[PDB]
Every structure is written in structure tokens, then in C-alpha cells.
Amino acid sequence: WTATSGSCKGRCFELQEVGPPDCRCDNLCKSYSSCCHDFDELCLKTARGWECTKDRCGEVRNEENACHCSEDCLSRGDCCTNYQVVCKGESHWVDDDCEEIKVPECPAGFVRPPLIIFSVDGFRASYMKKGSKVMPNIEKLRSCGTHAPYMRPVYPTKTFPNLYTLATGLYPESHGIVGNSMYDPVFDASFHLRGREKFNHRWWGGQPLWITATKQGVRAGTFFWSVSIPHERRILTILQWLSLPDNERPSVYAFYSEQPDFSGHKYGPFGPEMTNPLREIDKTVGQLMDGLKQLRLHRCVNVIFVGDHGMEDVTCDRTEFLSNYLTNVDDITLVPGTLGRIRAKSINNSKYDPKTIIAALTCKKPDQHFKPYMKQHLPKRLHYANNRRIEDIHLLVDRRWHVARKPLDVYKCFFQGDHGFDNKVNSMQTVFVGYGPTFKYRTKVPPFENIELYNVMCDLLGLKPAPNNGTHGSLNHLLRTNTFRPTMPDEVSRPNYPGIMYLQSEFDLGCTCDDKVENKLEELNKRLHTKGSTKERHLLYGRPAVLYRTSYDILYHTDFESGYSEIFLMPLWTSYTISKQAEVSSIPEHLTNCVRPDVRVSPGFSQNCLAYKNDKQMSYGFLFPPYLSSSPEAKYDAFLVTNMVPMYPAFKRVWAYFQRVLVKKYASERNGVNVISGPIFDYNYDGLRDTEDEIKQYVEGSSIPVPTHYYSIITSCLDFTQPADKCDGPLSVSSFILPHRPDNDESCNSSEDESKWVEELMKMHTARVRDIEHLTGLDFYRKTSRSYSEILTLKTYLHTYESEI
């Protein structure tokens, strides 16, 4: 209940909030039914259209009009956007040639270039090209501004998570908005689209741009707009705010459009009925740029044209039903659609077993159009686990399909488009264009993740970003002028460089190796290998930096080089270069069980084979593969206890294929590759490395910890006519984070040869170097000829393995 006996007289779209019970006059008031009685009358005029006609120029002012064509309207800052064109014989913004904007042309009293964020729902990346013929205003922005072919959203590819990630730079798991619909088990409440619960502040974490602005003395226009407020009014409101005196005037503005998402659901992504929605966006953009030209701001303001996600062909008939897999369907709640989330219907039931739910959903039909995971087993690049609002059980749904619980939920067909799938899917990609004095001229940039923009928008506004998941500096190549020069973090732990300190007989590991067969030329030469005489062949980008306090040793060998952790009893990283000319060999008969002690590292800081024998679930593998040894002699180095890592047999299949076939293959395709591999420990699935006392799993009867994942970073020359190990120019990279899992239930073809399923699993588990840095606490690419900004961009790249957009 609100007494709304006040008035909006003089308060149309006031910027600060007066609380209950006094009536409101802001673009939010409708959503509370707390607008003053006269709001519609005064603040939402609609009379006489949104365009000056030839027969309205120099007219007498009449306050009841929606906009004005009167001689004094320029001053009042409330002209129609085409006032100058029709009346003063000016040309539309779109119809002028674009001159480069080498410096801000801002009128007096403007201390900084404003920022307008023009956000559009469901604007699929491929609209920029496939609709270019009917979007001339936006094609001017794109071609004269700075654009990327596409921009990658976050999972899930839904509106709320993506809009709030754009405003926070945070992953959904961090900011809290993990779906359009949500249940919080601590709150005992649901977050929905229709309803008022979504308004409470307790859902929203992190610090969005407008709060970041306000707290640092930069005033902001409001971001939310009510559904009923038409777009034309929204633009005039932004143009009026810009007329406000210097000390009242916001520096950052936002506009939003429900289109083209709204129509895309009805007609699909490319239905013929989509041309019209696109025409209207362009028209709206036209009114803004025309209106800015009127205020002498068109070479002063920076404009961001950005979408939240794309759109895919989806229909009712393409629905999987859980009622055809489970018998016990009324014992679960599903959050359905382009992604599934399952939980117990009642927490009062003791016999609710997720192991058995996943069983019944795994590879149960050759058709199957979805795949269950436990959230911690999701690809780490999705960063979709670390929140109480995300249910333990998750369904990754195939592009073009839906998941529902029972058939009745789907009839008690209409739609032809939807969105929400995995964020590396082409149809889900969206747009970025930046145009203005601070952005670059006629410049294309590589695709980037939307988590990066918060940082840039803070830069555009001279703000200091709140802690976020962007990598600040990685988008400096978008900007004409930078206020952030990124600097490399300092190494926390310096290594030990141990020599030969131990005799064989001091080791009691229970490990045998047949290696007792017997020169000054080639015996002087392999000591040199252990001092690192070939370290600049196998360690091309300097040693990783350890960014935490720990104790580790650098170990040199002929073929490879490692940083060995005395705490975790295995390498943090292993580095080696495989040239194009290198040859694959096999593990000879006599060395199949061979595990040699390392005489640089004490018995007490080593693994032992006895644990592996006694633990019937856990086998072992090697980080540097014996298969790629340079010679029969060097192959012995690969069997050192200090190259050894614990591996479930099931996972040895995956790993073996990678080491035996794929590395050589990549070395052929890319003219050699540098490989760095190591373990990852993340039992708390927060995407960050775990300390010694968070380890949940050891090899039975030992202090040998068990990685939750294994990673590799594969670098080469981008100019592939140059060997990896002699690259003059920019680098090219691909990475992965394989889940270390006791089975291969994730791959429904696993009973076949490794050549059918392994490389497919690895593609799904593609990863950014930065993702690995978070999980390891290391820092790569410390010594290159390349600028640090470029290296940041390199570390944020993700190889998607998709086709061309």
C-alpha cells in the first residue's frame, strides 16, 4: 500500500529515489504500482508522433506534445530527433561520411566523454552481416567504429545472467544470478521473471557499473526501463538527461531493447518476420545518433552496441522427456528447457540418490539429445558450479532441443526459437561494436568473452573496477587511449636447483627398473642436460612463476623440464617441445613397469610404487610421455619417480591416446608444438587452486594427492611457416582441462577405439590458459618478445572448434 497523493509535476524521470509512502516518477515506478496519479499524463505524452513534419517548424510550443519542433526546443533539450533535418535542412547522421575522431569534440562544460550502452536482447552475431542491407545506421557504427566478429556470452546463455555479467564482469556463480529462474535453499524462495521476489537485493551480488560509478563520484542514469515505456520515449529521456546542467548530468547511460529476442522466440532466428524488428532497432539507433548530432555530442560520446546472447531454432516436437528415462518422476523437481537442473522435490526424503538419477540418464538411448553431469564434472570453462543456487545435477542440452519432465508440461505448439545452450555454440554468440573518440577507427578485433567489458567500461569512465573475473589489459587493443597499463605479478616462490645428493640405496619405494648396462665425450654431455644445456629448446616462454608460498625444485632433462612440488610430491608443471620432424616410439618390452628413483630428490619427498600396488582403484601415468623420447637413452629419464602422476585406469586410456597420437599430430599440423602439462586440485569446485589442507583424496595409505583434473597448454607460431622453437612473431595456443574421472561414462562411445571418442572429449573440455592459471596459481609466458597486452589476449583466447559463424 502506497499513498500516491503527490504529483510528478517537475519530476519526470527524476534520477534519485524517494521511498514509501510518497509517489514515484522514475522509469521503475510502474513495476511497484507506485507512480503518481498524473505520471501517464505528464511523463508519457504520445501526442503528434515522434517525428517533425514539414508543417510543424517554428511552431508555437504546446506542452502536451510528445516532442517539439518549436524554435526554442533546442534549448529545452526536448526536440524531436529529426528537428534539425526537416526544419534546418541538416542531413541524418547515417547519411554523412564518417570522419576519424582523433580527439573528443565535446561542448564546453563536458569534463569527460559520456558513455551510452545500447543493449539489445537476442541479437545473434550473424545478424550484423545477414541483415546489413536493412540496418544502415548500425552498419555505419560497425564499419567506422571498432567491432568484433562476435562476442561470447556466459553460460547459461539466458537474459538475466548475461545482462548482470555485463554489468559486473563476474561469472554468474559469483554474482548470484545463475538462471532466469532460480531456487535458493537457504532462502526457501524462488526467483522468477513474473513476480516481485526478483526485486529484493539479496539475490544480486558483486558491484555493477552504476554502483561502481556512484561510489566514485560519477553520476549515472538508471539502467532498468519498464516494458510499457516505448523505445522512442526512452531515447528522448537520454537526450534530455544530456541537456541537464553540468553538475546534474550523468556520465553513463543505458538503453535496452526487448527486440529482437521477443520476435525471435515466435519466428525463429531467421524467420521472414525478423526483418521488421531489425529495421526498428536501426531506426532507434538513428534517432539517438541524430539526437546527439543535434546537441553537438556525436563526436564526443562513446557508444557501445552490445547483445546478451543469440537465438537458435527450437520447437516443441524436439523435446526429450525425463518420464521416458525415469520411473520415479514425481520424486524430482526439474528446471527445464535449453538446460536441465534437477533436485529432490522434498528434502524430507532420506532415500534420494543422485548417483542413481545420473545412472538412469546416462547413454540410455542412441538418439539422446542431452547429457547429465554432476555440476563439478561440467567443463571448467563454463565456470558453472560454485553456488548454492546451482543444483548438483545438471543437463547439458543439445542445440535445437529442450528437456522437460513429463509430456503434460509441454501442452498444459507456439514457439520456434529459444536460447540458453553452452556458450561456445555458434547460434548463441552475440555482438559488440564500440564507436566514439576513445574507441579506434575502422578496426576489427578478435572475438572476446563478455566478462571482459566491465573493465573497459570503467576505463571509458576513469573508474577503478571492483574485483572481477575479467583480465584487465586484455582489451587494450580496442581503445585509442589507455588508462590501464597492466603489469606482471611478482613471483612469490623462487625454486631450488638441486644436484645429485642421494644414492640409490637410500630409497625404499618398492620400484624396480631394468636399467643396469654400461666414454668421456657423451658422458660429459648428459651432465650438461641436467644443468639445462637444452632448456631454451623445451622452455620457450620462460619458466612459469609460482604465485603462492611453497617449496619446489626445477628439474632439467634432455627432452623435458619440470617444476617439482615437495608438498604435493609431483610436478606442478612439465615443459617440452615436439618438433615436426620428431618421431613416436613405443615403451620397449623390458621397461613396461620401470620406475627409477631420482637422485636429486630425497626419499621423503618422493612418491613410491608400493601405494599404487596396494590401491586397486588407482594406477599411475607420466607427464612427459616416454613415447616421444628423443633417443633410447633419454627414454630412461621419463620413468623417474618425479615424472609420475596418479591416474585411474579409465583415464589412462584418454591420456595415453593424447600422448601417443595427438601431440605428434598437432606437431605436424602446426610445425611443432610446445606442451606444458600438469595436475590441478579443485575439490571445492570454486575454479581456484586448493591448498594442502583441502585435499579430499589421497592414494590409499600415502600422502600422494589425487588431481581432480589434468591440464595441457599447447603453443606454436601463429605464422606456421616458422618452427615453434624459432618463432619471431605472435603465438597461437590451445589448452584443455580434462576431468580426472574413474570411468568414461561421459563418453557414450568409450567402448570403441580411442580414435572415435577421445579427441571429442578433449574438445568439450577446451580451456583458456587463464582458466588454468586460476586453478594452478602459476603464471605463464613471462619471457617472450611480445607485449604484455598481447599476452593477456593470448591467455584469454579459447579454441572453440566450431565452424565459421
Ligand X SMILES: *[C@@H]1O[C@H](CO)[C@@H](O[C@@H]2O[C@H](CO)[C@@H](O[C@@H]3O[C@H](CO[C@H]4O[C@H](CO[C@H]5O[C@H](CO)[C@@H](O)[C@H](O)[C@@H]5O)[C@@H](O)[C@H](O[C@H]5O[C@H](CO)[C@@H](O)[C@H](O)[C@@H]5O[C@H]5O[C@H](CO)[C@@H](O)[C@H](O)[C@@H]5O)[C@@H]4O)[C@@H](O)[C@H](O[C@H]4O[C@H](CO)[C@@H](O)[C@H](O)[C@@H]4O[C@H]4O[C@H](CO)[C@@H](O)[C@H](O)[C@@H]4O)[C@@H]3O)[C@H](O)[C@H]2NC(C)=O)[C@H](O)[C@H]1NC(C)=O
Ligand Y SMILES: O=C(/C=C/c1ccc(OC(F)(F)F)cc1)N1CC[C@@H]2CN(C(=O)NCc3cnn[nH]3)C[C@@H]2CC1
Interface with ligand X includes 701 (CB under 6 A)?
no
What would the x/- binding string for ligand Y be over residues 140 to 179, using CB under 6 A? -------------------x---x--xx------------
Number of residues that bind ligand Y (CB under 6 A): 16
d(C-alpha 321, C-alpha 406), whole Å: 6
Using the minimum distance from each CB to ligand X, give the nearer residue, 600 or 795.
Answer: 795
Tell me if 260 contacts ligand X by CB under 6 A. no
Cβ within 8 Å of residue 157, ≥6 positions away:
309, 310, 338, 419, 420, 421, 422, 423, 425, 428
Grid cell listed for 415: 514457439
495 binds ligand X (CB under 6 A): no
Residue found by looking up cell 534546418 in the block: 88
CB of 682 to ligand X, least distance (A): 10
Site string for Zn ion, 259-298 (x = CB under 5 A): --x-------------------------------------
Of 101-130, which residues contact ligand Y (CB under 6 A)? 117, 119, 121
Site string for Ca ion, 690-729 (x = CB under 5 A): x---------------------------------------
Which cell numbers in the block locate residue 769?
A: 590458459
In whole angstroms, what is the distance from residue 348 CA to residue 242 CA? 57
User: Least separation, in Å, of the C-beta of 774 and Ca ion?
Assistant: 9
The H or E element spanning position 253 is strand 252-260
* Cell numbers given for 83: 528537428
For the CB of residue 680, give the shortest distance to Ca ion in the complex, in Å.
Answer: 9
Chain residues 204-233 in contact with ligand X, contact rule CB under 6 A: 205-207
Assigned C-alpha cell, 145? 567504429
Q: Which is nearer to ligand X, 173 or 459 (CB)?
A: 173
- Residue 690 marked as a ligand binder: yes
**Positions of chain breaks in the chain, given as the residue before each break (C to N > 2.5 Å):** 412, 518
Nearer to ligand X, 386 or 606 (CB): 386
DSSP assigned state of 68: B
Does 745 contact Ca ion by CB under 5 A?
A: no
Q: Does 688 bind Ca ion (CB under 5 A)?
A: yes
The answer on whether 313 is annotated among ligand-binding residues is no
Say whether 317 counts as a known binding-site residue.
no
CB 428 within 8 A of CB 421: yes
In the chain, the amino acid numbered 167 is A
Residue (148 or 314) nearer to Zn ion, CB: 314
Cβ partners under 8 Å of residue 762, min gap 6: 654, 658, 662, 736, 738
328 is in an annotated binding site: no
Residue with cell 561542448: 107
Cis ω for the linkage preceding 20 (within 30 of 0): no
CA dihedral 175, 739, 657, 614 (to 10 degrees): 160
Q: Binding to ligand X by residue 264, rule CB under 6 A?
A: no
Q: Does 312 bind Zn ion (CB under 5 A)?
A: no
Q: How close are the terminal C-alpha atoms of the chain, in Å? A: 51
Q: What angle do CA 104, 105, 111 make, to 5 degrees?
A: 65
Active-site residue (options: 146, 159, 558, 574): 159
Helices (H) and strands (E) in the chain, counts: 22, 28
Q: Does 466 bind ligand X (CB under 6 A)?
A: yes
Q: Which does 466 bind (CB under 5 to 8 A by kind): ligand X, Zn ion, ligand Y, none?
A: ligand X
Nearest to 566 by CA among 538, 544, 598: 598
Return the bridge partners of 714, or none: 675, 734
When asked if residue 401 is in the footprint of ligand Y (CB under 6 A), the reply is: no
Q: Is 308 annotated as a binding residue?
A: yes
3-class state of residue 54 by DSSP: helix
Shortest distance, CB of residue 173 to ligand X, whole angstroms?
5
Q: Binders of ligand X among 155-214, rule CB under 6 A?
A: 170-171, 173-174, 176, 205-207
Per rule CB under 6 A, is residue 376 in the interface with ligand X? no
> Choosing among ligand Y, Zn ion, Ca ion, none, which partner's interface includes residue 308 (Cβ < 5 to 8 Å by kind)?
Zn ion
Q: What is the DSSP letter of 203?
A: G
CB of 175 to ligand X, least distance (A): 6
Q: Which does 690 bind (CB under 5 to 8 A by kind): Ca ion, ligand X, Zn ion, none?
A: Ca ion
DSSP letter at 337? B
* Count of residues making up the chain: 805
Asked if 421 interacts with ligand Y (CB under 6 A), we say no
Known active-site residue 159: yes
Q: Return the closest-CA partner of residue 724 out of 670, 677, 676.
A: 670
Q: Are strands 332-335 and 339-344 parallel, antiparallel or unpaired?
A: antiparallel
- By annotation, the residues acting in catalysis are 159
Annotated binding site for Zn(2+): 121, 159, 261, 265, 308-309, 419
Rule CB under 5 A: which residues touch Ca ion? 682, 684, 686, 688, 690
Annotated binding site for 1-hexadecanoyl-sn-glycero-3-phosphate: 159, 180, 261, 419
Rule CB under 6 A: which residues touch ligand Y? 117, 119, 121, 159, 163, 166-167, 180, 209, 223-225, 254, 256, 258, 261
Rule CB under 6 A: which residues touch ligand X? 170-171, 173-174, 176, 205-207, 383, 386-387, 466-469, 687-688, 774
